[PDB]
Amino acid sequence: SKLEAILSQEVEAEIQALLQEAEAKAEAVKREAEEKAKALLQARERALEAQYRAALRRAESA
Amino acid sequence: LIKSLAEKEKQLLERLEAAKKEAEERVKRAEAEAKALLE
Amino acid sequence: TRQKQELEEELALAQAYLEPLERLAALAHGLDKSPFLRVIPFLLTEKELPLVEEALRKALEDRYLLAHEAYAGGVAALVVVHRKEVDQAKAALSRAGVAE
B28 to chain C nearest CA, in Å?
A: 30
**Way the structure was solved:** cryo-EM
Give the class (CATH, top level) of A1-62: mainly alpha
Q: Which chains touch C (3 or more CB pairs under 8 A)?
A: A, B
Q: Is C64 left (phi over 0), alpha (psi -120 to 50) or beta?
A: left
Angle C30-C42-C81 from CA coordinates, rounded to 5°: 45
Q: Strand C65-68 to strand C75-80: parallel, antiparallel, or no bridges (unpaired)?
A: antiparallel
What is the stated resolution of the deposited model, in angstroms? 3.6
Contact yes or no for C61 and A2 at CB 8 A: yes
Taking a C-beta distance cutoff of 8 angstroms, is the pair C49, C68 a contact? yes
DSSP tag of C79: E
Q: Strand C65-68 to strand C40-44: parallel, antiparallel, or no bridges (unpaired)?
A: unpaired
Dihedral (CA of A7, A13, A16, A19) sign: negative
DSSP for A7-56 reads HHHHHHHHHHHHHHHHHHHHHHHHHHHHHHHTTHHHHHHHHHHHHHHHHH
Taking a C-beta distance cutoff of 8 angstroms, is the pair C65, C82 a contact? no
DSSP for C31-59 reads -SS-TT---EEEEESSS-HHHHHHHHHHS
Contact yes or no for C65 and B4 at CB 8 A: yes
Contacts with B27 from chain A: Cβ below 8 Å: 22, 26
Q: Does residue A12 belong to the interface with chain B, where contact is any CB pair within 8 Å?
A: yes
Q: What one-letter code names the amino acid at B26?
A: R
Residue-range domain boundaries for chain A: 1-62
Comparing CA positions, the residue from C67, C73, C80, C64 lying closest to residue C20 is: C73
Contact yes or no for B19 and A14 at CB 8 A: yes
Contacts with A12 from chain B: Cβ below 8 Å: 15
Q: Which chains touch A (3 or more CB pairs under 8 A)?
A: B, C
Polymer length of chain A: 62
Comparing CA positions, the residue from C72, C79, C32 lying closest to residue C54 is: C79
